[PDB]
Symmetry: C2
Subunit: 270 residues, 2 copies
C-alpha cells in the first residue's frame, strides 16, 4: 500500500577502517541509499578494551550519527556488535543491525558437509561468538575457528595484494586446508581485501562468506519491512565519512579500498 | 549476546488453500519452527470482495491466531496482503509479513535484461501491485503482467499435473513467451503447484520467482532480527491447520500438496 520515500542516510559505525568493506557492499547493493560512516580510529582498537569502554564509545558514535539524521544503524565491526548491539537496538527507535548473525545465517545455508570454518582476530575467535551462533542453529556442525593475527595489519597497511600478504595468509591458513571445510566465514571486516588470496589458499571448492555483504543483504530486507527505502528518483546523493583520527590516513585508505572517486572525509571529535 | 529460545508457533493466515505453498516452504526452510495455519475457505474468495470485508475477515483470522499464541504473523495471500498488511502490522506487537514485497525484491535481484513478468489472478494483476512495487525499485524495468483466469481452478481441483493443466497453462502463457522475459513472478500462492508446467512452457532461461518461498526467506531473517527463533533442540513439535470451511476438503488438499504424513486439520468458526 503506502510506500514512503525516506532519503535520510543509513548509518555505519566502526572502531576503525574495517567497516569500509561493509560500506563498499552497501554502495553496490543499495545504489539509491545515502550513507554516513564513522570510524573511531582515535580509540581503535576496541578489542583489548573493557566492555564498558566499548559500549560507551559505541554509544558516542551512535548518538553522533542519529543527530546527523540516520534512519537505520549498522554496527560494522565484530567487537561493537558483540558488546553493544542489543543494548543500542533496544534503546533506539530506528533499526539496528550487527555483523555476526547475517554471516552465520549465510554459512548455515551454504554448507553442504557441515564442516564450517571461521577466521578473524584472536579476540573474535576467543569470544566464540561465531561458534555459538552457528551451533545454536545447527548443532551437528563441525566448526573450526582460526585466529589470523597479522591479517588486519596487512590490510590496514594497504599491502593486501603484496608478497608479504600471500605469505602471511598461506602460512596462517595452512592448518585449515586439511579439514574438509566447504564454507569459511570471513569473521573480520578487514578480510574482504584479502579475499583473492584466501580463496586461492583455500581452494575453489570452499565457499567464502563475507559477513558484511550478508549484513547489507539483511539491510535491504529491513528497508522494505520498515518502509524506510529511498527512491530511485532521488538516488544516492550523500556519502559522508567521519573519523576521530587522522582524516588523511583515512581518506587514503578509504579511496584505495572503495576504489572509486574522491571521498568526503571529515575529522570529528566524540 | 542473549539469544532467546521461543517455541511459540509462526502464524499463517489465508483466504483459502493457496497459502499452503507458503507453509510448505516454511516447513522446508524453517525445520525447527512450529506452525499454525488458518484458511477462511467458508468466505473464500476475498478478491471480488470490498476492502472493508477483507480487512474484517483478515482481522478475525489474525485475532484467532494471536489468541492461539503466535509470535509472528505471515499473511500468505496477495489479496489480504494488499488490503490488510499495513493496518495489522501497525496495530500488532508481533512482526507481520506479506507476500508481495519479498517476491518483488527477489525478481529485481534475479533479472538480467530488466524484462520482468508476473502472473496471478485478474484481481492481483488489475491491482497493479507488483508492477508498482517493481518499478518503485527499478523504474527501467519492462514489466509484463498477465492474468491466468483458470490456474487457481486447476490447482484447487488437484489437477495441476493433468493434461487439462498443461493445455490451460500452455495457452494462457503463450503471449508471454515472446517478450524476452528472463524473470517471471508467480504472483499467486496457488501457482507453485503448476511450476513444472510453467517452467517448461516458459523455457529454461526464465527464472521463476516463488513469492511465498521468498517471503519465508524474509521470515528467517526476521526471526534473528527480533530474537524470536525456536531452538533445534526443541525442533518443530507443532503444525496445526484451521479452516472455517470443510475440514475434509482441506485435509484432502493439504496432504496432497504438502506430500507428507497425516496433517492436523480442524474446522473452526470466526
Amino acid at each position: 500500500m503506502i510506500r514512503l520515500t525516506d532519503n535520510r542516510p543509513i548509518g555505519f559505525i566502526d572502531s576503525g577502517v574495517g567497516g569500509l568493506t561493509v560500506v563498499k557492499e552497501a554502495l553496490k547493493q543499495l545504489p539509491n541509499e545515502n550513507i554516513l560512516f564513522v570510524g573511531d580510529t582515535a580509540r581503535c582498537p576496541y578489542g583489548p578494551r573493557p566492555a564498558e569502554q566499548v559500549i560507551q564509545y559505541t554509544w558516542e558514535m551512535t548518538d553522533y550519527l542519529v543527530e546527523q539524521g540516520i534512519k537505520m544503524l549498522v554496527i560494522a565491526c565484530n567487537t561493537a556488535t558483540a558488546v553493544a548491539l542489543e543494548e543500542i537496538k533496544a534503546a533506539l527507535s530506528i533499526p539496528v543491525i550487527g555483523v555476526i548473525l547475517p554471516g552465520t545465517r549465510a554459512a548455515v545455508k551454504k554448507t553442504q558437509n557441515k564442516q564450517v570454518g571461521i577466521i578473524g582476530t584472536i579476540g573474535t575467535v576467543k569470544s566464540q561468538a561465531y561458534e555459538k551462533a552457528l551451533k545454536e542453529k545447527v548443532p551437528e556442525l563441525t566448526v573450526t575457528s582460526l585466529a589470523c593475527p597479522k591479517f588486519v595489519s596487512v590490510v590496514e597497511s594497504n599491502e593486501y595484494h603484496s608478497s608479504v600478504a600471500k605469505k602471511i595468509v598461506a602460512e596462517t591458513l595452512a592448518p585449515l586446508t586439511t579439514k574438509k571445510i566447504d564454507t569459511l566465514i570471513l569473521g573480520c571486516t578487514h578480510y574482504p581485501l584479502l579475499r583473492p588470496i584466501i580463496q586461492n589458499v583455500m581452494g575453489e571448492n570452499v565457499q567464502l562468506i563475507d559477513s558484511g555483504a550478508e549484513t547489507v543483504g539483511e539491510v535491504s530486507m529491513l528497508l522494505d519491512y520498515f518502509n524506510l527505502s529511498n527512491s530511485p528518483q532521488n538516488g544516492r546523493t550523500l556519502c559522508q565519512f567521519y573519523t576521530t583520527g587522522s582524516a588523511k590516513l583515512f581518506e587514503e585508505i578509504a579511496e584505495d579500498w572503495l576504489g572509486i572517486g574522491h571521498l568526503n572525509v571529515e575529522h570529528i571529535e566524540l
